[PDB]
Amino acid sequence: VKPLQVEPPEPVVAVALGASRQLTCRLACADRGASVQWRGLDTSLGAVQSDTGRSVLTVRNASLSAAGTRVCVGSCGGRTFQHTVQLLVYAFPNQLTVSPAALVPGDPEVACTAHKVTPVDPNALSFSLLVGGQELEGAQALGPEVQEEEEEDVLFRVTERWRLPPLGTPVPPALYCQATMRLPGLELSHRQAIPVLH
């Protein structure tokens, strides 16, 4: 095993807005002046270096400013070791709004808005329009519209819209909007019912 080890070891660690995470950097060293440094936001909270074999970095009540690349550097007997890990701070939406909130057969469009979300990158944040547990075939996605929420941290409001196909017979009792967020080691989802009236 390498002299320097970080737990957790993954190159990207995701932390929710308001949550906590602890990164422990351990350096095995027989010599006396072994040093462990946590840095990466040196222009900000700053770098911290100690004569030690163990240094723990803790993010508490994570804010978006906690995000960024951290590096643990260990020095033992003139040799230097490192581990680089990106902290990703995200906010999964705490509310979806569907418009219209209920559909009548024949309605041509439905919109689903995710509130207070970040990141908005479509490679992480996705929207699906389902009937049963399957994607509704023929639903044309008009593309996410992104805006800031009103005024730490600035979060976003993201709306997907679909032109609807005929819903067919038998008419489904509901559609569902699902917002899904995919990050390293994580898949988060929010499915909201859309009643179909009449």
Ligand X SMILES: *[C@@H]1O[C@H](CO)[C@@H](O)[C@H](O)[C@H]1NC(C)=O
Q: Which residues bind ligand X (CB under 6 A)?
A: 61, 63
Would residue 116 be called left, alpha or beta, if left means φ above 0 and alpha means ψ between -120 and 50 degrees? left
| Comparison of 36 and 155: residue with beta carbon closer to ligand X | 155
| Comparison of 135 and 149: residue with beta carbon closer to ligand X | 149
**What is the nearest approach in angstroms of ligand X to the Cβ of residue 155?**
11
* DSSP state for residue 95 in the 8-state scheme: -
**What is the nearest approach in angstroms of ligand X to the Cβ of residue 89?**
12
Structure token pair of residue 57: 């970095």
**What is the nearest approach in angstroms of ligand X to the Cβ of residue 18?**
6
Cα Rg of the chain, angstroms: 23
| Comparison of 61 and 123: residue with beta carbon closer to ligand X | 61
- CA contacts within 13 A on the Cβ side of 6: 26
Beta strands in 30-144 (DSSP E): 35-39, 48-51, 54-59, 68-76, 79-90, 96-99, 109-117, 125-131, 134-135, 140-141
- Assess contact for 39 and 23: CB atoms under 8 A: no
**At a CB cut-off of 8 Å and minimum separation 6, what does 104 contact?**
196, 197, 198
| Comparison of 150 and 187: residue with beta carbon closer to ligand X | 150
CA-CA-CA-CA dihedral for 60, 180, 161, 198, to nearest 10:
-120
| Comparison of 88 and 89: residue with beta carbon closer to ligand X | 89
**What is the nearest approach in angstroms of ligand X to the Cβ of residue 153?**
6
| Comparison of 58 and 61: residue with beta carbon closer to ligand X | 61
**What is the nearest approach in angstroms of ligand X to the Cβ of residue 157?**
19
**What is the nearest approach in angstroms of ligand X to the Cβ of residue 63?**
5
